[PDB]
């Protein structure tokens with residue numbers, strides 16, 4: 450008999466994810482079906498999104514050889530029925546206060562920082578780069594969380610050293626680039642570019658660096674279709690482009706500039722978006738989402 454979610458203490462709420470205490474050394478990591486676009490959590494959930502992204506994360510944890518926070522199988526009896534397939538039993542870690550970002554391509558705040566200064570997070574780059582330019586080698590572009598409604602703040606390596614220690618900063622940098630490089634090559638082989646990604650790490654009782662959070666999901670990473678990769682223009686979001694096009698199109702009645710909360714999505718846009726998530730998962734994992742556990 451699976452426990453009720455109400456049996457666990459709620460310890461943290463993020464935009465799309467929830468964290469619960471299971472016991473002194475374990476947490477329940479829960480992905481929801483909520484989707485964010487243009488820095489708004491939208492009214493309309495994407496069916497099965499939490500399950501698909503959990504399946505994705507589990508695949509990539511298994512692909513990477515590095516220590517990670519998983520503490521049980523996806524059907525672990527400590528997982529409540531209501532979140533089965535979109536929740537994981539994980540080891541509680543002392544989390545390091547660094548958003549560990551790898552960028553293989555130049556976009557978003559990385560591109561903006563470069564266009565303003567010629568550098569990103571302390572990396573002085575060649576002249577002549579632009580939107581969706583390939584970055585080789587990939588860059589470690591760490592960030593720190595800001596206030597509730599604010600974007601993360603890009604910082605340089607010295608800032609990371611001041612947060613976690615010199616040797617630990619080195620370790621974060623090296624592991625971030627190593628696992629990004631592996632996952633990105635794997636995805637591209639299957640026709641998907643992982644343009645960038647954001648990791649969080651924690652430390653266990655033995656002082657070991659442990660990969661936590663979710664890894665290489667379309668929420669933590671920019672997914673692009675490789676078949677349409679065209680440097681110099683903004684790449685479509687593999688998963689979210691239908692959502693973005695509808696919100697900013699003539700049928701939504703919404704003005705992006707207004708900063709007013711956007712309206713709910715058409716059901717058919719939500720279902721199409723679910724299909725994109727499944728396609729990305731199945732292409733990258735080589736597995737069938739129909740085999741992934743659920744309620």
Ligand SMILES: N#Cc1cncnc1N
Nearest residue numbers: 518539540541542661662
């Ligand atoms: N993910 C995650 C996490 C957060 N806080 C503490 N431990 C963890 N494994």
